[PDB]
Amino acid sequence: SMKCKFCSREAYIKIHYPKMYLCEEHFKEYFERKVSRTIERYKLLTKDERILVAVSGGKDSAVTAYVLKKLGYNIECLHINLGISGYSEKSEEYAKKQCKLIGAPLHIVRIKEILGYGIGEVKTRRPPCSYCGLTKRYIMNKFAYDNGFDAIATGHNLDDEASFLLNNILHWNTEYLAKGGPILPQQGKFIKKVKPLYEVTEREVVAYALAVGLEYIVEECPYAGATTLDMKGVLNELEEKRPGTKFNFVRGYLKKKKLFEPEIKEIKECKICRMPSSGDICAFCKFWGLKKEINFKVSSTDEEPFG
């Protein structure tokens, strides 16, 4: 109970699969090997690829960027500052401190600077979270496309997958349920999106961040009581009662995911930015009322202006 399975050092955490108590260093190894297997299993990345990590200042993206760097991947990071007064400044400061420790270049996009408004400052009854998700997802893909990155890696973990799944099944969001899993392959101007933490729990992510010295922000905004926090608690209660519930729900989902494909509405190029649009002008451009394209091509980072 008190000691590590592979050494005489004090146990740091208890790992359920396989059953084992691991010290700080054997946990780090376990974790990294788990991420490494997820990459190979779903053929997520190759070491020749230039990977962009979307870093929010939260633990999930911090850990994603940290483990990919440790594994030997070619990674660069992107932080999207949402311009939320009293939130966005510390979020950026957190993301900078993380990328300095990781030793990865950090690119910053300030929404307030390019668009004029922060998330929650736009005159709309539309909840800040919906248009924020739209904004982040667009900036991530366009920054990556504009700078010739081959793949985007996000920090979503098993708990995020299972919670997103439960919410969407409860609202029967079958379109969202067709576009799921650890990899959204590269299609047109959509850059390949990957989730290397897909098979690791939020608990394991928290323990990794603390053991390697990563400091992160819990809340990215003051606009997040949403369903996901309720779903995670639900799934945790079901997981402590029936161990293997979360894994099975996601494993089962990946096998049946096919059934939701006919629900997909059959994707042209935007007339403003030339990015994937369902209509004449894409949702991002239509929302922000843009008549001009945003060029995310960078010659260098702010912390390394001469490289």
Angle at 133 between CA 140 and CA 90, to 5 degrees: 80
Shortest separation between residue 31's beta carbon and Zn ion, angstroms: 13
- CA distance linking residue 175 with residue 221, whole number of Å: 26
Phi and psi, residue 54, nearest 5°: -75, 105
Report whether 99 belongs to an annotated binding site. Answer: no
Q: Which parts of this chain interact with Zn ion (CB under 5 A)?
A: 4, 6-7, 9, 23, 26, 270, 272-273, 275, 282, 285
Between 140 and 275, name the residue whose CB sits nearer to Zn ion. Answer: 275
Between 9 and 43, name the residue whose CB sits nearer to Zn ion. Answer: 9
Residue 11: DSSP 8-state:
P
Helix H segments across the chain? 24-41, 59-71, 88-102, 111-115, 128-146, 158-170, 202-211, 227-241, 245-256, 283-288
Shortest separation between residue 147's beta carbon and Zn ion, angstroms: 18
Between 9 and 90, name the residue whose CB sits nearer to Zn ion. Answer: 9
Report whether 77 belongs to an annotated binding site. Answer: no
Shortest separation between residue 272's beta carbon and Zn ion, angstroms: 4
Q: What residue has token string 């990899």?
A: 183
Shortest separation between residue 249's beta carbon and Zn ion, angstroms: 31
Beta bridge partners of 193: 152, 184
Shortest separation between residue 142's beta carbon and Zn ion, angstroms: 9
Between 26 and 96, name the residue whose CB sits nearer to Zn ion. Answer: 26
- CA distance linking residue 56 with residue 64, whole number of Å: 11
Q: Tell me the three state secondary structure of residue 25.
A: helix
- CA distance linking residue 15 with residue 215, whole number of Å: 23
Residue 17: DSSP 8-state:
T
Neighbours of 97 (CB within 10 A): 16
Between 84 and 285, name the residue whose CB sits nearer to Zn ion. Answer: 285
Shortest separation between residue 143's beta carbon and Zn ion, angstroms: 14
Between 29 and 89, name the residue whose CB sits nearer to Zn ion. Answer: 29
- Which residues are known binding-site members for [4Fe-4S] cluster? 129, 132, 221
